[model samples]
Target chain A: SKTKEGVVHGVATVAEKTKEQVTNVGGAVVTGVTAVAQKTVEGAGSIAAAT
Target chain B: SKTKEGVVHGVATVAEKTKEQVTNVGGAVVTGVTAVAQKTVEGAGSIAAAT
Candidate 1:
């Protein structure tokens, strides 16, 4: 019984940690994409003015 | 040059964050597998004693 309890606890901890890691990746991707999009828009304006 | 700099910086940040996430998952998997192995060993002993 004790061993089973330990297994249950271990599995729960792993799942929680994995969930948090994925969440971090999601946030990083969102921030990175937003930054890139802003830069692209600014570059487009510069090209219009130069032409 | 500036826009490209922003894009480069963004990519670097995303890559670093992703690396950390994968490392975390690796640790979690190791812990989980160890717990399961220990529990299985204990259960096997119990069965041997019963028979």
Candidate 2:
């Protein structure tokens, strides 16, 4: 997702900075969001419209 | 970052629905959270303040 690339980028930064402390936490958070976003789209929610 | 999980979740839905063709190329924006809810910098933004 190029559009959301920045978000992940920012997150990756935090992960990089925090390293061992936050890596798994960050991945889980991102993966969770990925799931929700996918679910919302599957539910026929127009993201463009939502935006 | 855990707090941001929901935003990513919604984005993920879009990615999956579009078969990853419609990944968020636009960049995930940080909302003016304080405008919507009683926001908190907590220890997070304070990191910036410390710098």
lDDT at position B51, candidate 2? 8
Q: In model 1, what are the clashing residue pairs, if there are any?
A: none
Interface RMSD of each: 27.5, 18.6
Residue A37 local lDDT, model 2:
26
Instruction: Look at candidate 2 and tell me the lDDT of residue B13.
Output: 13
State every prediction's TM-score relative to the real structure.
0.13, 0.15
Model 1 error, position A46 (Å): 19
lDDT of 2 by residue, A13-47 (tens): 11122211112211111111211122222223222
If you assessed candidate 2 against the hidden native complex, which CAPRI class would it receive?
A: incorrect
Residue B11's lDDT within candidate 2 is 18
What C-alpha lDDT do the candidate models reach, one value each? Answer: 0.18, 0.20
Estimate, for each residue in A14-50, the C-alpha lDDT of model 1 and write its tens digit: 1222222333222112111121111121221111110
The per-model DockQ list reads 0.03, 0.03
Best by lDDT: 2
lDDT of 1 by residue, B1-51 (tens): 111121112121111222233232121121111111111212211111100
What's the residue-level lDDT of B50 in candidate 1?
9
